mmCIF file with all atom_site columns, all heavy atoms in Angstrom:
data_model
loop_
_atom_site.group_PDB
_atom_site.id
_atom_site.type_symbol
_atom_site.label_atom_id
_atom_site.label_alt_id
_atom_site.label_comp_id
_atom_site.label_asym_id
_atom_site.label_entity_id
_atom_site.label_seq_id
_atom_site.pdbx_PDB_ins_code
_atom_site.Cartn_x
_atom_site.Cartn_y
_atom_site.Cartn_z
_atom_site.occupancy
_atom_site.B_iso_or_equiv
_atom_site.pdbx_formal_charge
_atom_site.auth_seq_id
_atom_site.auth_comp_id
_atom_site.auth_asym_id
_atom_site.auth_atom_id
_atom_site.pdbx_PDB_model_num
ATOM 1  N N   . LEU C 1 20  ? 13.223 16.238 19.998 1.00 45.16 ? 22  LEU C N   1
ATOM 2  C CA  . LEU C 1 20  ? 12.510 17.153 19.121 1.00 45.16 ? 22  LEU C CA  1
ATOM 3  C C   . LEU C 1 20  ? 13.063 18.543 19.117 1.00 45.16 ? 22  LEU C C   1
ATOM 4  O O   . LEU C 1 20  ? 13.149 19.227 18.083 1.00 45.16 ? 22  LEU C O   1
ATOM 5  C CB  . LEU C 1 20  ? 11.010 17.180 19.592 1.00 45.16 ? 22  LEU C CB  1
ATOM 6  C CG  . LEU C 1 20  ? 10.144 16.032 19.098 1.00 45.16 ? 22  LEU C CG  1
ATOM 7  C CD1 . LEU C 1 20  ? 8.752  16.204 19.679 1.00 45.16 ? 22  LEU C CD1 1
ATOM 8  C CD2 . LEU C 1 20  ? 10.153 15.915 17.578 1.00 45.16 ? 22  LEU C CD2 1
ATOM 9  N N   . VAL C 1 23  ? 16.040 18.481 16.922 1.00 48.71 ? 25  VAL C N   1
ATOM 10 C CA  . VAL C 1 23  ? 15.699 18.508 15.482 1.00 48.71 ? 25  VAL C CA  1
ATOM 11 C C   . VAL C 1 23  ? 15.300 19.871 14.992 1.00 48.71 ? 25  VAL C C   1
ATOM 12 O O   . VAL C 1 23  ? 15.779 20.284 13.946 1.00 48.71 ? 25  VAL C O   1
ATOM 13 C CB  . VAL C 1 23  ? 14.602 17.470 15.221 1.00 48.71 ? 25  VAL C CB  1
ATOM 14 C CG1 . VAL C 1 23  ? 14.108 17.589 13.796 1.00 48.71 ? 25  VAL C CG1 1
ATOM 15 C CG2 . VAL C 1 23  ? 15.147 16.077 15.495 1.00 48.71 ? 25  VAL C CG2 1
ATOM 16 N N   . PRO C 1 83  ? 17.421 1.134  -3.877 1.00 56.23 ? 85  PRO C N   1
ATOM 17 C CA  . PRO C 1 83  ? 17.876 -0.225 -3.904 1.00 56.23 ? 85  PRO C CA  1
ATOM 18 C C   . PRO C 1 83  ? 17.351 -1.131 -2.818 1.00 56.23 ? 85  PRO C C   1
ATOM 19 O O   . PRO C 1 83  ? 17.030 -2.327 -3.128 1.00 56.23 ? 85  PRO C O   1
ATOM 20 C CB  . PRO C 1 83  ? 19.438 -0.059 -3.709 1.00 56.23 ? 85  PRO C CB  1
ATOM 21 C CG  . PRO C 1 83  ? 19.661 1.227  -4.432 1.00 56.23 ? 85  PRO C CG  1
ATOM 22 C CD  . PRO C 1 83  ? 18.487 2.127  -4.074 1.00 56.23 ? 85  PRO C CD  1
ATOM 23 N N   . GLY C 1 127 ? 21.950 13.938 3.351  1.00 78.41 ? 129 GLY C N   1
ATOM 24 C CA  . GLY C 1 127 ? 23.095 13.195 2.877  1.00 78.41 ? 129 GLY C CA  1
ATOM 25 C C   . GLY C 1 127 ? 23.953 12.544 3.882  1.00 78.41 ? 129 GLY C C   1
ATOM 26 O O   . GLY C 1 127 ? 24.979 11.984 3.493  1.00 78.41 ? 129 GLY C O   1
ATOM 27 N N   . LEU C 1 135 ? 20.734 10.876 19.080 1.00 75.32 ? 137 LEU C N   1
ATOM 28 C CA  . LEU C 1 135 ? 19.670 11.723 19.704 1.00 75.32 ? 137 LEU C CA  1
ATOM 29 C C   . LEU C 1 135 ? 18.863 10.768 20.606 1.00 75.32 ? 137 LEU C C   1
ATOM 30 O O   . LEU C 1 135 ? 19.387 9.735  21.081 1.00 75.32 ? 137 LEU C O   1
ATOM 31 C CB  . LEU C 1 135 ? 18.843 12.454 18.686 1.00 75.32 ? 137 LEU C CB  1
ATOM 32 C CG  . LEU C 1 135 ? 19.580 13.426 17.827 1.00 75.32 ? 137 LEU C CG  1
ATOM 33 C CD1 . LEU C 1 135 ? 18.753 14.535 17.261 1.00 75.32 ? 137 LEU C CD1 1
ATOM 34 C CD2 . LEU C 1 135 ? 20.703 14.077 18.676 1.00 75.32 ? 137 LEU C CD2 1
#
Side-chain angles (χ1 to χ4, degrees):
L22 279 178
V25 173
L137 297 203

